[PDB]
């Protein structure tokens, strides 16, 4: 099955989703002397409800954050988006040096590593499942870490990883105050996209804020002791987990700001 090593990793993707190499693929480089400001992108609308937050697990590619989207207590609104966008899931990606964790790239910048924040379109779609399937279904708010001071809010996250060690486990997790764990700045880039994981679904607006947000070097490492494996098989180490750039083949990149 796919993964992140070796014989399973990114490179070897396409071998079993083709659309691995289409032409919406996330995530990219961002050059930003070719970014175009646009002035009819709105700041971002965020409502995120702490409570919303109910369980952590380790899916062997990311720990999750899993929010009841039952219905709109915690929604994106505004920036590029048509409507509004229920929160789903939360997860990180990150690689085996702080040098070069994150998956957009910003003018050959990597960063320590890069938060997701999913959320679907319940405005024309009836679940999260249905809306992963369309090119307006889906919008992921991406959020920088570099290494700096420990991020108390995500303390709360490493103190849970020994109990989701193993690939399938998980814990309770709520109170989660995802809106205090935003930068202080939300000006953006923006572009069409995909998933960056498998089934890499060509369903994404993207939203990648430009200003990160730290972590200490030991919270991100703690992350690395994830495994890729269930309880009961070859131990592995997910020390890393996120996907190269992808050719941008055209696509217009967008920034809030100028
Ligand atoms: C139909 C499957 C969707 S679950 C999921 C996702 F929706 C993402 F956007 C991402 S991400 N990295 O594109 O924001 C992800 F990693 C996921 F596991």
């Given at each position: ?107 050959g910048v990597s960063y320590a ?100 947000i730290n972590i200490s070097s ?41």
């Open positions: 099955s796919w993964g992140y090593r070796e014989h399973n990793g990114p490179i070897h993707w396409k071998e079993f989703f083709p659309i691995a190499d289409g032409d919406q693929q996330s995530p990219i480089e961002i050059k930003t002397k070719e970014v175009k400001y646009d002035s009819s992108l709105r700041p971002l609308s965020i409502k995120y409800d702490p409570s919303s937050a109910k369980i952590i697990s380790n899916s062997g590619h990311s720990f999750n954050v899993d929010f009841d989207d039952t219905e709109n207590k915690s929604v994106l609104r505004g920036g590029p988006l048509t409507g509004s966008y229920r929160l789903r899931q939360v997860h990180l990606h990150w690689g085996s040096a702080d040098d070069h964790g994150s998956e957009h790239i910003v003018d590593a890069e938060l997701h924040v999913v959320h679907w379109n319940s405005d024309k779609y009836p679940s999260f499942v249905e809306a992963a399937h369309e090119p307006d279904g889906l919008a992921v708010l991406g959020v920088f870490l570099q290494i700096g001071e420990p991020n108390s809010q995500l303390q709360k996250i490493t103190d849970t990883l020994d109990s989701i060690k193993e690939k399938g486990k998980q814990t309770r997790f709520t109170n989660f105050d995802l809106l205090s764990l935003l930068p202080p700045s939300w000006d953006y880039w923006t572009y069409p996209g995909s998933l960056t994981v498998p089934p890499l679904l060509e369903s994404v607006t993207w939203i990648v804020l430009k200003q990160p030991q919270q991100l490492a703690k992350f690395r002791s994830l495994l890729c494996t269930a309880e009961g098989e070859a131990a592995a180490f997910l020390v890393s987990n996120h996907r190269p750039p992808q050719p941008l083949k055209g696509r217009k990149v967008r920034a809030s700001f100028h």
